[PDB]
C-alpha cells in the first residue's frame, strides 16, 4: 500500500532473457505454423472465428518496439498463440499436434528462466 513495499524484484534482464526464449520458439522446427500472420483473406473462418490473431513475428515487433509493459504481458501473447491455434485446429492434426509441442516448450523456458 501507501510508503509500504515488497523488495524489489530485479527485472532489469527481462527484455532481454523474453528475447532469447522468442529466439528459441522462433528456431524450433514446429514453429513453421506461427512464423507469420494467418492470412485473413486466405483461410476461410479465421477472420471470423479467432477475435485476437497474434503470431511470433508480431511479438517480435512488439518486443523490440516497447509494447510490452512487462514480461506477464508478454507470456500472454505467447499463450494467446497457442490458444488460438487449439481453438481452430484439432488436436490430431499436424498444425494442433506443433501447437501443444511448442507450448510445453515454451512453459519450461518460462519456468526455468523465470520461476
Known sequence: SMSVKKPKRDDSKDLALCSMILTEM???????????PVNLKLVPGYKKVIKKP??????????????YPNLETFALDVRLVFDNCETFNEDDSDIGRAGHNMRKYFEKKWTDTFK
Open 54 to 67: 497474434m503470431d511470433f513475428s508480431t511479438i517480435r515487433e512488439k518486443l523490440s518496439s516497447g509494447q
Open 26 to 36: 522462433e528456431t524450433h522446427e514446429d514453429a513453421w505454423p506461427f512464423l507469420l
